[PDB]
Amino acid sequence: FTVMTKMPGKETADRNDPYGETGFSSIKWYYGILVKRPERLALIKTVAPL
Amino acid sequence: EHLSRELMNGATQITEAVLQKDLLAAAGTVLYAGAATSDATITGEGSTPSVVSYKNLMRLDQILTENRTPTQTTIITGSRMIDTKVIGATRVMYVGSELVPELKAMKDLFGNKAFIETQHYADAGTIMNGEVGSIDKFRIIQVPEMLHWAGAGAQATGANPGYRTSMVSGQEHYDVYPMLVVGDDSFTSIGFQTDGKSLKFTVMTKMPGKETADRNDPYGETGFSSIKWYYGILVKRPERLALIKTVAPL
Amino acid sequence: PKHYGKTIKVYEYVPLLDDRNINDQGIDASGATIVNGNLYGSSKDIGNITSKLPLLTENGGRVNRVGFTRIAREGSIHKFGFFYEFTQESIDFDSDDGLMEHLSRELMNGATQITEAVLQKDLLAAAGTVLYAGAATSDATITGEGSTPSVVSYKNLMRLDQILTENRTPTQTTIITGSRMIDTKVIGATRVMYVGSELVPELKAMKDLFGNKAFIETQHYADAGTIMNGEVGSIDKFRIIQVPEMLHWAGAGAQATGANPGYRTSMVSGQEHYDVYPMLVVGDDSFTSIGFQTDGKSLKFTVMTKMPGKETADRNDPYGETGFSSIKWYYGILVKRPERLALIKTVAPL
Amino acid sequence: MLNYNAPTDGQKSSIDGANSDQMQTFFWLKKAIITARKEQYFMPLASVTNM
Amino acid sequence: MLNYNAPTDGQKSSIDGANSDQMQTFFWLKKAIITARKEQYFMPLASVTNM
Amino acid sequence: PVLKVMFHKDTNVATVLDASGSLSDGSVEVGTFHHPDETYPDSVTIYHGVRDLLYKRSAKDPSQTASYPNNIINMQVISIDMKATPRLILGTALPRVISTIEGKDVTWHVDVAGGKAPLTYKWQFKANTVGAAFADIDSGENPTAKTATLINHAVTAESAGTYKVIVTDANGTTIESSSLLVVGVQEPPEVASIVAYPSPLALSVADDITDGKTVKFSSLPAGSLIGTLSIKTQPDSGKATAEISGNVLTVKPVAAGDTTVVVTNGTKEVTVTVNVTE
Amino acid sequence: MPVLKVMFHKDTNVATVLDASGSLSDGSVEVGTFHHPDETYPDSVTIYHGVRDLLYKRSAKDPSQTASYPNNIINMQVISIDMKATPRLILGTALPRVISTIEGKDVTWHVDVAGGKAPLTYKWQFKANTVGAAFADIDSGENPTAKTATLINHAVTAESAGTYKVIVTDANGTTIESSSLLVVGVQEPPEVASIVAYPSPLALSVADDITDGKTVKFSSLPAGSLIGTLSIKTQPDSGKATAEISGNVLTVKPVAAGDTTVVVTNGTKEVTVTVNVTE
Structure with a gap:
């Protein structure tokens, strides 16, 4: 996971938000x-009771 | 790395082309080959085609002497090697690759070869960068990126004896090629914040990552690179910029 | 290297201002999407260049975006070989006890000659800068008769040098500025050109733009400059090297009739046609040879010999009377740079 | 006979079935071909006046 | 925007023209998958008399 | 093609013939094989085909079949006589891709060897549009489409596509090669000026009153879109009349004296001076 | 790449992305159009990148008019995007790139497709491995599974080998396709080792079977071997029974009570049918 965080302040002050009142946090x-061997993955499909 | 190198190469080439275009447009001493009086009359066919001649170069030198454009080179008085020639050229002329064969086929006033190749006087004098030879008063420098006016001449037809043409509005027209002399003190470059240089490139590059992570892209997946x-x-002295307009052979 | 097939590939990165730079990254100075992202490309027209300048204002913005491109070149190797056979009696009863030495020497000489010929043929076929003498536009139109025979002229050499200068093919030699020996001449040649024996007389009869002798023999400048191996002289910008085994396209030209003033011809399908002869320039870094298991050489010969005896006694020859020797x-x-291979095609005198 | 054939031309080797191919059909020469910067002749001619 | 795109699916990258494509569109795992030898149950039961 | 093989027992001569060929020298038919091979065209040849065919025939009597070691396998004494049509070989293949720009002439050339002469050439074009198939380039307007060399003058953005040449010999054997043409396209430069020719226009009342004379207009730079032309300012009606159609101005004299016509495309203007004589 | 319209309300700062034939009457101004599955980079961009590109060319004081930086709509944090267009069509379960089988086995292809406008129709096609062969619609009448998401080609022979293609279409006419190569592995038929007759023995009654007789069927061993042409090598005793053979069926008619035999051959193998005739 790559986590990017920018807290409010100078780091987010920009012509879009001159006051830098918002931040964000993202993960990607x-x-x-x-x-390799698909036949070794076995699966049974069925209904289930309520 | 490839992209940055190509960007810088394009920038330098663009600046060179812009400066050349400005110098060509600023010429005050303009001479038309043949009987042409304007760009539209430059023609490669007819009885008096607009091809540069020895007398055209002589008259350009005359005009540059009348307005007192300073000379750039000193005459070469010869060497002791056999098969060497003395050179009386005192001015520098810039031409494109298209015109060089035309200048090499030129005849002097007696019908002999007017073009002198550099090897005939390289021992006695310094050969300039890009020089291809000399004609009576001018030392010819071939410019790799010499510009021209495509299709700015007269309309060409099947009578075209082999001069270059460009398609304009669905019709073929003759190209016009410059022969330029850049006299001393003729012009100067305006250097704004260039630290004494004529030009200064400002390159801004931002790579993907936290540098470009923003409200518009929280993930910072994109970058860019700009040059300005x-x-x-x-x-200063437009008359010291001399120009000859002529057609060029195929 | 082994286990990579028979092909080598390489990238070529195009400059931004180039007509080959076709891409969809273009945004003009007004911010509008445009069809080309190479600005004005390879144009030298002042008007076209002016309209596509990357002009910028004080507001900046997304204006004047450009793109780039790259190309892939490729080449591959091919397989060659031949052999010969002999019997024991052809060795034991023959007068010359050194026959096998002669045969092996001749086999190797033939192999080397064949490799040289194949390389020359490939170089001739790969030329990117091809010039046709006279008014010809292809091999089939190369003619030795008519009002304008396809004979190499001073202007053709001039144009070939011009083209090689525009595309920035590096020069190979420096000019000779003369000597104090009487009867010597100064040489402006800067490139090396390869021709066959058949064209040299035509070159030696060549006239410059003013009717004077264009060809300069080596003795006239051997004092001041080094003479290259195989050199016969110089014309204008080229130093002429005579190749003993220069190849030509026999009968590849136009049909020849009684009007033939004396140029060479060959019979093709029962009909007479003119021969086409090359004048070749090999620029620097234009090509490379693919060496597969050649230990750094362009080529490697494998020789396989089996002599008569038990080494060849077999179900097919119970007596072991035959032997063979092969080469492969x-x-x-x-x-890499096809434009740096320049070629002039012309007829040759008888 | 197990033949290499000509994989680059669509002629598969004998060892490769309908759902297989050669992993390496060519060798990549990693040194690219590039062009040099165009020369400048008029820029060196320009004198500079500071703005 | 210069995009990688999906070269493996026929979508060329922004840098590749008509004459070019990616030299390496995948990584080759050189350790191959193989099947073990089938078991034998009757051969061990066989005694041998010389012929 | 399918090649028939005939074998002569007494001379150990194997003759290769076209499928329809025959001999009457006592040779017996031993089989046929495909040349070039359908699955390995460039890995085997006629020698391998003949060897494979001979391997399955009796040495005692080539008419009968036999197994090893009673078959013909000693090729060293077998002479292969080739009488079938030579294999069709593409000597000079086309360049897989050609890059150019609008208004350029493009030439394709192919060299083919072998086969039964005379050879015939047929070129085809496939547009880049979806579902477009190969279509023959009509040889009427473009005669070069019937020859080994194809010339396309002043290519355009619509010429981009795949060009293919099909070469057929007298026996109907076909060989083809293809090339992709990429045409670089650029935005047309904006009109910086309109040029009139002739300008000035000289008219005679005596000679030109019926038909007048014409002035043609072009744009600078060349290849810019001139747009729709209109007369912004008519000439003096006492001196001349003027009409414009497309890029042609027609001017008719009325009486001697000078006048002017101003023509515009809505963004640029050009003045034509008109000199009228008696 | 269906073209999507985009409209922008300047007060709510709401961008509604609609279909090309779509409309909105809420004070929204058309700001342009863009192909959603982009036509060059279909998986490198989304609706967001299209609305951001169309709004950069419009004024932040009047979206109906165009503008340049720094007076354009360029803060997307304040802008919402309201999708009212058909969802993009997405192959969720693509077909395998190659299926390998043996002759006589049933094959099954299956595609799953999300998005689009219901209902989604399906059309399976087949190209032969033959020369200059073109995709052709599988008979949806003969095979009723060729009009559904799961095609089933029962007992695939060598002729089945070739490229199968499914084409899924939405109610708007937007399509998406997937293709699979079928390889049908083939083995030389085993040689006939024997012929089997059934029933054998054949029981006949003169009273019941005199008109129509009874039949014996022949099969080859191993199963799948070519039995060849059958003929009677030895007729039954004509005083007990008569026999005729057609294809792989022997018909035997009683004449009188008592045992007899019929020998049938394919020229290389023989089988004896014992025939027991009762009154």
Whole structure:
């Protein structure tokens, strides 16, 4: 996870918000898998009781 | 790295082209080859085509002497090597690659070869950067990026004997090519915040990350790179900028 | 290297101001999306350049955005080889006990000659700067008769040098400024050109733009400058090197008739056609040879020999009377800068 | 016969099936081809007056 | 904006022209997948008499 | 193509023939094979094909089949006589991509060897639009489409696409090559001026009163869109009359003396001086 | 890339993204249009990047008019985006790139598609591995599964080998497609090792079977071997029964009580049918 945070103040003062009253926090990542032997993943599909 | 190098190369080329265009437009001493009196009359066909001649160069030198444009080079009085020639050229002329063969085929007043190649006088005098030879009064410098006026001449037809043309409004017209002499004190560059230089590039680069993370992009996925500058010239002595307008062979 | 197929690929990065720079990144000085992102490209027209200048105001903004591009070049290798066979009797009963030495020497000489010919043919086919003599526009229009035969002239050499200067092909030699020996001449040549024996007389009869002899023999400047191997003289900007095995396109020109003033021709499909001869310039960094398992050489010969005896006694020859010797190799080139390979095509005198 | 064939031309090697191909059909020469900066002849001619 | 796009899916990157594409669109895992030898149950049961 | 192979027992001569060929020298038919190979076109050849065919025939009698070691396998004594049509080979292939700009002429050239002469050439074009298929380039307006060399004068943005050439020999065997054409397009520069030619316009009342004379207009720089022209200021009606159609002004004399016509595209103006003589 | 309109209310600072045929009568001004699945970078940008680009060219004092920086709409934190256009169509479950099978096995393809405007229609096509073959609609009448999301090609032969393509369309006519190569692996038929007759023995009654007789069917072993052309090598005793063979079926008719045999051959293998005739 990559976390970016910018608190209110000089760090967010800009022509859009000259006073720098807002901040933000974001999180992002990359993910994926490679399936080598799909036949070794077994699955049963069924209904379930209430 | 490739992109930054290409950006800087483009910037320098653009500045060179702009300065050249300004110098060409600022010329006060303009001479038209053949019988042409304006750009629209520059023609490669007919009985008197607008091709630069030896007498045109002689008259350009005459005009530059009448208005007292200072000379740039000293004459070469010869060396002791065999097959070397003395050179009386005292001025510097800038031409494009398109005109060089035309200047090499030029005849003098007696019908002989007017163009002198650098090897005939390289031993006695210094060869300038980009020089291709000399004609009676001018030492010819070939400029790789010499500009021209595409399709600014007369209308070309099937009678075109082999001069370059450009398509204008669906019709073919002759190109006009410059032969430029840049006299001393003719112009100066206006240097604003350039620290004594004629130009100064300001390059701003922001890479993706927390530098570009913003209310408009909380993730900072994008960056940019920009280049900017100021430029201007002051033309002091427009008559010291001499120009010859002519067609060029294919 | 091994296990990468037979091909080599390389990137070429185009400059911003270039007509090959086709991209969709363009935004003009008013902020509008535009079809081209290379500004004015390779244009030299003053009017076009002025309209596309990246002008900027005090407000800044998203104006004058540009893009870039790159190209991929490629080349590949190919397989070659040949062999010959002999019997035991051809060795034992032959008068010359040194026959096999002769045969092996001739095999290797032939192999080297073939590799040289193949490289020359590839270089000739890969030329990006091709010039046709006379008024010809292709091989089939190269003619030795008519009102304007396709014979190399002073202007063709001038134009070839001009083109090589515009595309910035580096020069290969420096000018010779003369000597104090009487009867010597100064040489302005800066490039090296390769021609065959058949064209040299035509070059030696060439006239400059004013009717004087254009060809300068080496003795006239050998005192002041080094003479290159195979050099015969200089014309204008080129120092002429005579290649003993220069190749030509036999019968590739236009049809030849009784009007032929004396140029070379070949019979093609029962019909007479003019021969086309090359004048080749090999610029620096124009190409490279692909060396597969050649230990840094452009080529490597593998020789396989089996002599008569038990080494060749087999189900097919129970007596072991026959032997063989073979040669094989790989070769290929990668053309990096095709415009730096210049070529003039012309007819040649008989 | 197991043949290399010509994978770059769409002719697969014998070892590769309908759902396989050569991983490395070419070698990448990592040194790129670049052009040099164009020359300038008029910029050196300009004198500078400070603004 | 110069975008990577999806070269593997036929969407060229902004930097690649008609003559160019990505030299490396994937990473090759050189440790291959193989299947083990099938088991034998009757061969161990066999005694041998010399012929 | 399918190549028939004939074998002569007494001379160990294997003759390769077209599918329809035949011999009457006592040779027996041993089989046929595809050349070039359908799956490995450039990995085997006629020697391998003949060897494979001969491997499955008896050495005692080539008419009958046999297995090893009673088959013909010693190729060292087998002479292969080639009488079939030579393989069609593409000598000079087209450049996979060609890049240019609008208004440039583009040439494609192909060299083909082998096959049964005479060869025929047919060029095809496929536009970049979705679902566009190859269509023959009509050889009528463009004669070069029938030859090995194709020339397209003044290409445009609509010329961009894939160009393919199909070469067929006398036996109907086909070989083709393709190239992609990329046409660089740039925004047309804005009109910086309009040029009139001739200007001045000389008229004679005696000679020009019926038909008048014409002035043509062009834009600078060349290739800029001149737009719609109109007369902003008419000439003096006592000296001349003027009408404009497209980029052509027609001026008719009325009486001797000088006048002017001002033509505009709405953003730029050009004055035509008109000199009228008796 | 369906084109989407964008309209902007200057007081609420609300950007409504609508369909090209769509409209809003709330005081919103059209600010432009943009292809949503972008036509060059379909997965590198979204609606946000399109609204941000259309609003940069419009004035922050009157969105109906155009403007340049620094007087354009460029703070998107204050701007909302109200989507009222059809959602983008998304292949959630694509087809495998290649399915490998053997002859006689049933194959099943299945696509899952999200977004679009209901109802989503489906159309399966097939291209042959033959030369100059073009995609052609699978008969949705013969195979009723070719009009659904799951195609089922039962008992695939070598002729089945080739490219299958599904085309999913929304109520607006927007499409999206997926393709799969089928490889149908083929093995030489085993040689016939024997012919099997059933029933054998054949029981006949003179009273019941004299008109129509009874039939014996033949099969090859192993299963899937080519039985070839069958013929009677040895007829039954004509005083007990008569026999005729057509294809792989022997018909035997009783004549009188008692046992007999029929020998059937394919030219390489033989099978004897015992025939027991009762009164």
